[PDB]
Amino acid sequence: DRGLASANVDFAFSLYKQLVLKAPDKNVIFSPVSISTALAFLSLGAHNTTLTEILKGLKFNLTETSEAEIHQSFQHLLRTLNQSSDELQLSMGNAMFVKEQLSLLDRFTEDAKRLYGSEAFATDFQDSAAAKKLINDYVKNGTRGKITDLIKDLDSQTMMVLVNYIFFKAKWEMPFDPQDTHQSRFYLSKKKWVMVPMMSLHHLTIPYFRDEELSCTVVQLNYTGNASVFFILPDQDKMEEVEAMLSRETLARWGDSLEFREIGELYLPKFSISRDYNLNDILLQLGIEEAFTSKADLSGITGARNLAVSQVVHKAVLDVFEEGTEASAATAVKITLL
Template identity: 50%
Template sequence: MRSAGGRGEIKVRRELQSSECQGLPTVQGQGRRRGTHKDVFGSKMASSLYGVLFAVGLCAPIYCVSPVNAPSRYPHPSSTESTPASLVYSLNTDFAFRLYRRLVLETPSQNVFFSPVSVSTSLAMLSLGAHSVTKTQILESLGFNLTHTPESDVYRGFQHLVHSLTVPSKDLALKMRSALFVKKELQLQANFLGNVKRLYEAEVFSTDFSNPSIAQAKINSHVKKKTQGKVVDIIQGLDLLTAMVLVNHIFFKAKWEKPFYPAYTRKNFPFLVGKQVTVHVPMMHQKEQFAFGMDTELNCFVLQMDYKGDAAAFFVLPSKGKMRQLEQALSARTLRKWSHSLQKRWIEVFIPKFSISASYNLETILPKMGIQNAFDKNADFSGITKRDSLQLSKATHKAVLDVSEEGTEAAAATATKFIVRSKDGPSYFTVSFNRTFLIMITNKATDSILFLGKVENPTKS
């Protein structure tokens, strides 16, 4: 698998007091919010309205990683104890499936792939600078009941998540980072700046947006470098109205615990797209012991394949005509049920070798999930900057996924295990992912879904 790199971007657009504002209404004399308070800096100039662009992209490979050793700084919370971290992990999973269902509606009969943890982390970071209804809508869309959950617990939980996903491992490359690109003239609130650095370990870069093409190149270069070239050109169309961009990127790279042997990959295997169309794909193949089971309630097969390190991939194959039933039932509870009920057994498995990517304009999707004020004139991001009003103008997510048998240890390790079994050897079940299936990449330590998708057509990259 290649990379799935995620990131969130906040693009802040300034509403110029000019007739050349591209159709935007002129806003006179704005203070802290919509002209009801005086400018805290005492400026005689009318405050300006900014729009905020939020973009997310991601990258996840499944092959060899360079060994890195470092002790974990944070203990993993017990699955039975209720902590801010465990609450965030559980709610993130439900948010992942809610967003998945929305993306399926927006892009029917297409491949779906995204990093829910990157999107939720970016929204949580954005909420640090939001006030009133804007903050409430963001946090409630993530699943938090603010009547029962203190806001401080939300941020402590995400802080733990960010730290847990950035601890180096000798077997797994998993890096999630955030960056703020801020217009030189934009004066950020000290509290917001301190929190994004402390809670999210975010980097902050002073950026000259007077030349949009240079600023855009700087941001795209940063993300490309951090995702090892997997996510490119995530930012497009910056203009003179841009004042701030927030980026969250996630990179995952790992080796299969039981890798495929390339010599056994079948080069031209039929894969059913929809009900009648057949395409041909390279199909990886092996016989091994994997955690596997049949969910009779949801009419699907579930295969868990572990990576070296604290990560696993779930491949879910519903019975024909049962995909919609499966999609509607997906929840944190469903995933926990699978994790606890799958049993190790001999499996002959066929999985496509494929590469897919997906891009989404989340500004059309997040309002349907309850985040509405952030995208209109009622937005209150005065926690980011009091001098200028901010409004979320765009939310972009880009994801890339490669699944393959590659890895420096793959050939040797698998060649010794892939043997012809005698007739009296162990019996095995054959499962072929030769039609639409779901894929989830999870972090075991946090029970978090790093990447989630549906493969409709593995030949469509």
Template identity: 50%
Template sequence: MKTTFYMSLLLAGLHAVAHGQLLPSHHNGHDTNEHKHHAHEAIACLKLVPNNADFAFQFFKEITLEAPNKNIFFSPVSISTAFAMLALGARSTTQTQILEGLTFNLTEIQEKEIQEGFHNLIHMLSHPEGGVQLNMGNAIFLTEKLKPLKKFLDDAKALYQLEAFTTDFNNPMEAEKQINDYIERKTHGKIADLVKDMDPQTVMLLATFVFFKGSWEKPFKPEHTEEREFFVDAEMTVKVPMMYQTGRFDLYFDEELSCTVVRLHYNGSATAFLVLPAKGKMKQLEETLVKETVQEWSEHLFQSLVSLYFPKFSISGSYEITNTLNKMGIVDVFTDQADLSGITGTPDLKVSKVVHKAALDVDERGTEAAAGTAAEILTLSIHPTIEFNRPFLMLIFDRDTNSTLFIGKIVNPTITS
């Protein structure tokens, strides 16, 4: 009988504040040594980028199949990081399944390179440029009886900034409070009540979280926000506060996928792609979206003066993702076949379930706009209007590492969870 451990993953809190003209990221005031260090880290995590992106879009496809016509919001980088850390303590087939489930080809990249890559990725994401706040972290909560190997704890601390805590799972309410308080504190209140109904048999819980707060390069003006209609589907319309501004935006019309893409930069190194499929074309987009699609959008963007309407909304996604990961080939770790002997030295440990929760706020706020916004003067000229008044996708990337921080599908912006 395997002892189970509960992976209460991925707590992603995102607060996005609104807009921007697309400018390349600038690095100011860094000395040469810092540049060299940055470059080394970038090279180390560069190897992970294609795999992490493949994992992100595969996971998105699975989640959309499980929850059709619902809001979706999750952090792929959070899920990847948690399972890469778990792979540190996995052995044999269990470890292979985890790494291959994260879409790594183990004939092309070694486990050591993967671990170093994630270590550098976490470091780079945790030290972003000014204007973006991004906190990532990992914590392990252990029953007193379970003694993890010193090597596992040392490696996990060094590579993943892991914090370890002793927890009394025999008292589930007390354990839940300890874990939820820790997560809530670390995500600045964005993720609350992550774990509930804990099994008293739990002996270890692994939590991974990411908190993001970004301000648009040019915020929307609150006085321009007005209630407008949002068409959830053919039968249902809701009223939403719709933000508005006229300006030069990076655009692309993807004729093949019948969607409009608008790219907005945050201050710092984060970028949002807002993707508005034509009516009835969301399913086609969900089924075909891959990293190459986003790459193509990036390469074909052009600047154009438009009137942009974008809803102000808050949503969160909460998922029990064990089945999703099963479909992606991560199977043994959840069964009595699990080999997590690298964590405790004995093979009697398995993951009981994996919980992922993510939250997103989008509103007008941001840093003060730079003086002299020429676009404001051009509001009388004739230009197209793009209004996000039907279901759309929102993809948030970190430009420095090319990491997919968050993927969201907003079907109904008035439903918060």
């Protein structure tokens, strides 16, 4: 789906740049496709300016596509990602947790199940600790225990939470031998470093590109299955330059410029990182505004303008090791009465 990939990758890099702005020296890990899917799911219930802002913020061109086409594209993406595979473990789920007394349009719950694969689970948010545990347990189950505390605070007056998770567990096509993993320096800056387990591979023929425009080295490592990873190594003090130039155009240039090279040695740390985010500020910066205000129009959920978003949260974890990679993420959209 080229039209979906183009919007979703534009959104990915717009998000990345805003995430870095907030905390410039911190690790970053997030799932763009989880956030895109969760906000597309939200847009199923959105109307008028609330809907336009969400779909524009997700980087769709609304002069050239329809909401109907977008939802069908996410339905197809979800079906493709959840297809059976012996090579790679990949799963994505959506759910809605809703106060039982809230009246939902039949069209909304039917469309949520058909397009996003979402059930509607009756949740008593006035029993806030129990509602929090239920939602966190759903995410824990979908992520094989890797995302445990997506929901930290949860208002007792919440009416609905929309949730997306993604789980990814893959083997390297060329796995590292743990006998070649040795504690080595990782330079936090030119004169400060920490010791990390540094994995290595010898005489490895992989796609490689030395980017002289951005002063960085790009390699692609494959997982068994259809997935791969671009690793980009800026020269020292060139990370900000590479970040400033991240874009769909740049990624396309990198992909178009790779050539196979037999690398003498590749050194890659074994590591695990995690991050959690309150995405309200970034989504407002991307122009998704009305959904958060008392002007919100989520009347495709209920038939009335009686709901508004309170928070969008995201948590993601990345584990890289000799045999492969495990990564997971989840996004929740918390919704209150208006």
